[PDB]
Amino acid sequence: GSVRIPVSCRHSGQCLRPCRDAGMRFGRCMNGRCDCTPR
Ligand SMILES: [Cl-]
Protein backbone atom coordinates (compact mmCIF):
# COMPACT_ATOMS: atom_id res chain seq x y z
CA GLY A 1 0.00 0.00 0.00
CA SER A 2 0.89 3.68 -0.03
CA VAL A 3 1.74 4.63 3.60
CA ARG A 4 5.47 4.18 4.13
CA ILE A 5 6.42 3.33 7.72
CA PRO A 6 10.06 3.53 8.91
CA VAL A 7 10.33 -0.25 9.62
CA SER A 8 12.82 -2.50 7.82
CA CYS A 9 12.02 -5.75 6.05
CA ARG A 10 13.00 -8.22 3.33
CA HIS A 11 9.63 -10.03 3.06
CA SER A 12 6.06 -8.78 3.23
CA GLY A 13 5.29 -11.20 6.07
CA GLN A 14 7.60 -9.11 8.23
CA CYS A 15 5.27 -6.10 7.74
CA LEU A 16 2.00 -7.68 8.81
CA ARG A 17 2.46 -6.88 12.52
CA PRO A 18 4.17 -3.46 12.10
CA CYS A 19 1.25 -2.23 9.97
CA ARG A 20 -1.34 -3.62 12.39
CA ASP A 21 0.43 -2.03 15.36
CA ALA A 22 0.36 1.29 13.44
CA GLY A 23 -3.42 0.99 13.13
CA MET A 24 -3.23 0.05 9.44
CA ARG A 25 -3.66 -2.98 7.20
CA PHE A 26 -2.09 -5.19 4.58
CA GLY A 27 1.57 -4.78 5.38
CA ARG A 28 3.88 -5.24 2.41
CA CYS A 29 7.64 -4.97 2.04
CA MET A 30 8.78 -2.48 -0.79
CA ASN A 31 12.39 -1.43 -1.23
CA GLY A 32 13.29 -2.94 2.17
CA ARG A 33 10.74 -0.94 4.22
CA CYS A 34 7.14 -1.66 5.19
CA ASP A 35 4.15 -0.08 3.42
CA CYS A 36 0.63 -0.10 4.83
CA THR A 37 -2.95 0.59 3.80
CA PRO A 38 -4.87 3.09 5.96
CA ARG A 39 -8.16 2.12 7.58
CL1 LIG B 1 -4.03 -6.49 7.99
| Every domain of the chain and the residues it spans | 3-37
Q: List, as ranges, residues with CB under 5 A of the ion ligand 1.
A: 25
25 forms beta bridges with 37
Strand ordering across the sheet containing 25-30: 3-8, 33-37, 25-30
Nearest to 1 by CA among 16, 38, 39: 38
Tallying the residues shown for the chain, one arrives at 39
Residue 26 CA, ligand 1 centroid: distance in Å: 4
Residue 10 CA, ligand 1 centroid: distance in Å: 18
Q: What is the resolution in angstroms?
A: 1.8
Give the three-state DSSP class for 39: coil
Residue 36 CA, ligand 1 centroid: distance in Å: 9
DSSP string, 9-31: -SSGGGGHHHHHHTT-EEEEEET
- Would residue 37 be called left, alpha or beta, if left means φ above 0 and alpha means ψ between -120 and 50 degrees? beta
Q: For residue 1, what is the DSSP state? A: -
CATH number of 3-37: 3.30.30
Cβ(37)–Cβ(25) under 8 Å?
A: yes
Residue 17 CA, ligand 1 centroid: distance in Å: 8
